[PDB]
Every structure is written in C-alpha cells, then in structure tokens.
Amino acid sequence: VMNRLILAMDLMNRDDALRVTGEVREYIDTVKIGYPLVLSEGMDIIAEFRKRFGCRIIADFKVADIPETNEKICRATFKAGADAIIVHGFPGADSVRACLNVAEEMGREVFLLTEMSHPGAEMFIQGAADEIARMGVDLGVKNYVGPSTRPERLSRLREIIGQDSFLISPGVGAQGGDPGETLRFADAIIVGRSIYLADNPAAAAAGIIESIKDL
Amino acid sequence: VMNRLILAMDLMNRDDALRVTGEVREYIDTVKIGYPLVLSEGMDIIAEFRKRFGCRIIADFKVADIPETNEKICRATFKAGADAIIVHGFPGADSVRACLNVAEEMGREVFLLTEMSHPGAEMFIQGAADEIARMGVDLGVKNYVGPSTRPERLSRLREIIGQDSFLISPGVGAQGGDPGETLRFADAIIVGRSIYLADNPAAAAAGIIESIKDL
Ligand SMILES: COC(=O)c1cc(=O)[nH]c(=O)n1[C@@H]1O[C@H](COP(=O)(O)O)[C@@H](O)[C@H]1O
Ligand SMILES: COC(=O)c1cc(=O)[nH]c(=O)n1[C@@H]1O[C@H](COP(=O)(O)O)[C@@H](O)[C@H]1O
Fold it and tell me: Which of A45, A52, B51, B115 is deepest in the core (most CB within 10 A)?
C-alpha cells in the first residue's frame, strides 16, 4: 500500500468523494469504499474510482450474514470491480469460508475484521477477538483488520496472525489512534475524517505520510 | 404483518424479484430487502417496491459498524424509503444507539439481530446473544430478530424481550426451521428460498399460510 496509508472514503456525495480522492491520490494507492458512499451513489462508483484513480479498492462491507447470503454479497461486490472485501469474523467459520470461496472463484481477497475500534467493541467483540483471529489463521485468511485505538490488542492480533499476514488498522486520527504507534504492528493505516473533513486533505495526507516516513 | 409472513427477497435480478414479489403479494404485507438485491440493482429498488406493491420494507443490512458510520448507513437507508432496518447487536451498545438515534430522527424503526440462524452462529454469537438481547431491552429496542433453526433459543429470546416486543424469525424452510414451531415464539416468520426458488411461489406462500392459519 503506497505510503502505508489507505483512504477511508466515507463522503456520501459523488462530487465531494471524487474531489477529495483526486486531491490525495498522489499519497495513496488504495481507497476503502463503504456503504455510506455506495448506498448513496450506487455500486458503479467502485469501477469509476478504479478507472479514474487507478487505485485498488477495498469494499468495506462488514459482511456479516449466513453463508448463502454472504456468497451473494461477495459475488455482487467483486462483479462491481472491488479488489477485496472486509468480512466480519463474529458470525463464525462457515460465514467466513463462504466469502473465501467466492474470492477464490473470482481471484479476489478477503480481509477479516477481528476486533473493532470503537468503545462498544469492548462489550462482545473483544472477548471473542483472539479466537476470531485464530479461526482466520485456520481458514487460511491472510489479510486482517484490527483497531488503532488499542495498540496492545493490535500487538496480540499480530502475534496470532504472524509476520507474513497483512494487517490494516482503522481508528487513526478522529477516533484517537496514532499513525506511528499503529504502524508498529499494522502494515497500513486506514484514515477517513482526518483527511476527508480537513480544510486541505492533501496537506492532511502529506502530514500523516511525513510522520510515517520518519518511522 | 399480513399472515405473519415476511418475504425475504434475495433474488439478484430486478425482473425476477418483481415477478415473484407480485405473485405472492396477496399473501404478505412486508418484504425484507437485503444487499443481494440492493447491491445488484441499486437502492432505488426500495422505493420502487414500496410504490408498486404498497408493502412495508425492512432493509436487512445487518448494520455492524462503528457509531458514526452506522449513522450514515441508516440515514441513507431511510432516505431510500425503508420502513425499518436490521442492526447487529454484537458491535455493542453505542453502535446500536447510533441507529436508534437516526430512526428516532426520521420516524423509522430498528430491528435488533440477537442470535443468527446458521451453524456458525454457535461459535461466538450464541454465547453473547442473551446479553445482546438484554442490551436491546435496556436501550429501548422493541423489534428483534432471532433464529427459527433453534426454537429453544427463540423461546429464551422471547423470555428476555417480553410479550410486547415484536420478534421476527428467519431460517424457515431452506435452513430447516418450521413455521408453526417458530410462531410459538416469534410474531412473524421470514421466508426466502422456500418461496422465491419454488416452481410456483404463490402456491409455496399459500401452503405456508394455510399451515399458519391452522395455528
Ligand atoms: C473493516 O471495517 C472498517 O474499516 C472499520 C472497522 C473498525 O473497527 N473501525 C473502523 O473505523 N472502521 C471503518 O474505518 C473508517 C474509519 O474512518 P475514520 O478515520 O474514523 O473517519 C470508517 O470507514 C469505519 O467505518
Ligand atoms: C436480520 O437478518 C436476517 O434476515 C438473517 C439473519 C439470520 O440469522 N438468518 C437469516 O437467514 N437471515 C436472512 O433471512 C433470509 C433467510 O432466507 P431463506 O429462507 O433461508 O432463503 C436471508 O435473507 C438471510 O440473509
């Protein structure tokens, strides 16, 4: 990932999402697109971004259904041109395996979300997160998401998944996480509002990248 | 809900989804629309169904993000005309409260998904499900989803949420659940494939309704 920085593009307007992504494109190679943008502007936005920016697109869809429905969601998402999809591990191994099977069929990747970054993640997800990560390892998952807001948890996650797995991490900036600390454990950080709500997104992205290079 | 039967419309083609929904409309008053259809045909499909069929629409989006992103997903979903949205409880109370706040602002409803119907739900969700349900009660949630495939769990869920809360239940038919047993505890059943993959969906829906009336 260019500069170890992934843009979380959660603006809900195509014109604003295009403007900001264009302004910061020199500093990233990967955009995370989620439901705020796709449910406002349509799934065609994924191929439009891929074409316009030549970026990789991670569809942050948090897939969290039964296996049969997960299959359908993943097929529709890769048909729309996404490079990878983020999947919840909490629904269990059959639900994750269904997403892995569609990614294998379509030559795509699954990222497993293990422990979330917000305060409520402490209630139920955190207590299951090490097990969810070990389930990922046992299913052959190679890409994971874990929380910038809890670097001790992100260290434990890294310990479970090993040094060869790819780990990306949201919660940097607005939610309180720090780029440099997070990159002690994660390969890349996800940043949304700190960039896309900034008066100058390119300057916000450049400032983050300057602090990453120093690491 | 008319006849206590909610159609899970997970066909991925607008023409097929419209045909089947029209054929069974005399037997339901509520259609559950999820991501298989919306990610294939666009969010405009929700208002189209509401207009064409005069049904209520439950958006089965399994919302399962941090509070700020959940807000955005719910706003986009109610803007598209959905009557209600299904929300995961596993991400914790702040994530659920964010959805409740948007539903209160827009005069809509939240359904809390407590325990899922597929086999993998046993790994992590089932052990947290009673607590997730009690969290719902303490947040003021009045509408819940629980599993037809485990009627003893559906009885425990009902015990926690009380007799005044509304409880709907998927997993009937294809996943092995029974209409009559499920309706001992749930107010309505959700049925997808048993109807929409049938050679004659209207006959499939009518057969289910005949067995419901007998209860
Ligand atoms: C895999 O899903 C995520 O990206 C996600 C998981 C998580 O635990 N925390 C989290 O913040 N996210 C998402 O990452 C983005 C964070 O954006 P932010 O920098 O806080 O504006 C946003 O799109 C969230 O929906
Ligand atoms: C609230 O979300 C659901 O509807 C859901 C939760 C769950 O635990 N199990 C479950 O089957 N569902 C959904 O309900 C539908 C079941 O359809 P089916 O009758 O099995 O074809 C389908 O849309 C599933 O995604």
Answer: B115
